[PDB]
C-alpha cells in the first residue's frame, strides 16, 4: 500500500475554501478552490493519493528573531508533518534556505488595497504619515518583506508596523479587507488576491503598482524527490493552458469597473 501524501494548506479565497453543500462533507471533500484543483492535477499527473490538512497554527510561515524557529506551513514541512504544501505560498530566499519550492505556478507582487476617492497614489504617501494606518498579514511573506527591507520607504513602514503590531498586523487577508472597510486603513497584500477582491467589492481598489515581484510555488521538505516532479507537472499544466483556465475559473469576477 503506497501511503497517501499529507498536504498542508490554508484557508484563503479563492485558492482554498470550504465548499458549500446541503449535506455534510468530510475529509478532502470539504475543500474547493484553485489550489485544490491544482492539487488534484498534481496527484493525477504524478500518480499519488493524498490527505489535506489545514496548517495547525493557521500561519503561512516566518522565522522568529531569537530562537530562529519557523512556524506555519513552512515549519510543518521542515518537521515532516506534511509531504507537500499546496497553497498561495510565496517563494522567497529565506524560505528556500529551509524548504524547497517547485517552479512557480502563478506570479504576483505586493501592492496596496484601499478605498476609492482618495489622492493616495503610492506606498510613499502612506509612509510619510500616520493618519491612514496600514499593515499586513502577520507571519507572512509581505510582513517579512518589510521587516528586512533596507529601502528607505519600506524601512519606515516597517518601523510603523512594528510598534503597532497588535493593531495593524492581521490574522488573515480577510481581516485585512475588513480593516479597510471599517477604519482608515490601507492593506499591503499580494496583487493576485487584490485582483480577486477588487473584482468583487467595487468600493475597493489597488493603490499604485507592484512593489516587488515573486511567485507562488508548491513547497516540499528540503531534499524531497517530489519537488522536481512537481515542477515538471506545473510546466506541463502551464504549457497546455490549464493554469490559465484555472485562474479564470476562480477569479471569475465579472464585476466592478476598472
Ligand atoms: N502568500 C503569503 C501570505 C500573504 C501575504 O504575506 O501577503 C505567504 O506566502 O506568506
The domains found in the chain, sorted by start residue, are: 1-108+214-258 (3.40.190.10), 109-213 (3.40.190.10)
Ligand 1: centre distance to CA 151 (Å) = 20
Question: For residue 17, which of 250, 194, 253 has the smallest C-alpha distance?
Answer: 250
Separation CA 189–CA 157 (nearest Å)? 14
Cis upstream peptide for 103 (omega within 30°): no
27: left (phi over 0), alpha (psi -120 to 50) or beta: left
Instruction: Tell me how far CA of residue 55 lies from CA of 129, 239, 257, in angstroms.
Output: 36, 30, 36
Beta bridge partners of 84: 7
Ligand 1 pocket at CB < 6 A: 60, 88-90, 136-137, 140-142, 189-190
Phi, psi for 132 (deg, rounded to 5): -85, 115
In the structure grid, which three cell numbers stand for residue 30, read together? 470539504
On the question of a cis peptide bond just before residue 178, with omega within 30 degrees of 0, the verdict is no
Taking the C-alpha atoms of residue 197 and residue 206, their distance in angstroms, rounded to an integer, is 10
- This entry's atomic model was obtained through X-ray
136 closest CA partner among 171, 97, 181: 171
**Closest approach atom of ligand 1 to CA 72:** 10
Strand, helix or coil at 72? helix
Contact 167, 151 (CB under 8 A): no
Place of cell 512594528: 162
Q: Three-state DSSP class for 256? A: coil
Strands (DSSP E) found in the chain: 5-9, 17-18, 31-32, 50-54, 84-85, 99-101, 106-108, 110-115, 133-135, 185-190, 204-207, 214-216, 219-221
Amino acid at each position: 500500500s503506497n501511503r497517501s501524501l499529507i498536504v498542508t494548506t490554508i484557508l484563503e479565497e479563492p485558492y482554498v475554501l470550504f465548499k458549500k453543500s446541503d449535506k455534510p462533507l468530510y475529509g478532502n471533500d470539504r475543500f474547493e478552490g484553485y489550489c485544490i484543483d491544482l492539487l488534484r492535477e498534481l496527484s493525477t499527473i504524478l500518480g499519488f493519493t493524498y490527505e489535506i490538512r489545514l496548517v495547525e497554527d493557521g500561519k503561512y510561515g516566518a522565522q522568529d528573531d531569537v530562537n530562529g524557529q519557523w512556524n506555519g506551513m513552512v515549519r510543518e514541512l521542515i518537521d515532516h508533518k506534511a509531504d507537500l504544501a499546496v497553497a498561495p505560498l510565496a517563494i522567497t530566499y529565506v524560505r528556500e534556505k529551509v524548504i524547497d519550492f517547485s517552479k512557480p505556478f502563478m506570479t504576483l507582487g505586493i501592492s496596496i488595497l484601499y478605498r476609492k476617492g482618495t489622492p493616495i497614489d503610492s506606498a510613499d504617501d502612506l509612509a510619510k504619515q500616520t493618519k491612514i494606518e496600514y499593515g499586513a498579514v502577520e507571519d507572512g511573506a509581505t510582513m517579512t518583506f518589510f521587516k528586512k527591507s533596507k529601502i528607505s520607504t519600506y524601512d519606515k513602514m516597517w518601523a510603523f508596523m512594528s510598534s503597532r503590531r497588535q493593531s495593524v498586523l492581521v490574522k488573515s487577508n480577510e481581516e485585512g479587507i475588513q480593516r479597510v472597510l471599517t477604519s482608515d486603513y490601507a492593506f499591503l497584500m499580494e496583487s493576485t488576491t487584490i485582483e480577486f477582491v477588487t473584482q468583487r467589492n467595487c468600493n475597493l481598489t489597488q493603490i499604485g503598482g507592484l512593489i516587488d515581484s515573486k511567485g507562488y510555488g508548491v513547497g516540499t521538505p528540503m531534499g524531497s524527490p517530489y519537488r522536481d516532479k512537481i515542477t515538471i507537472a506545473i510546466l506541463q499544466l502551464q504549457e497546455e493552458g490549464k493554469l490559465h483556465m484555472m485562474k479564470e475559473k476562480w477569479w471569475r469576477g465579472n464585476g466592478c469597473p476598472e
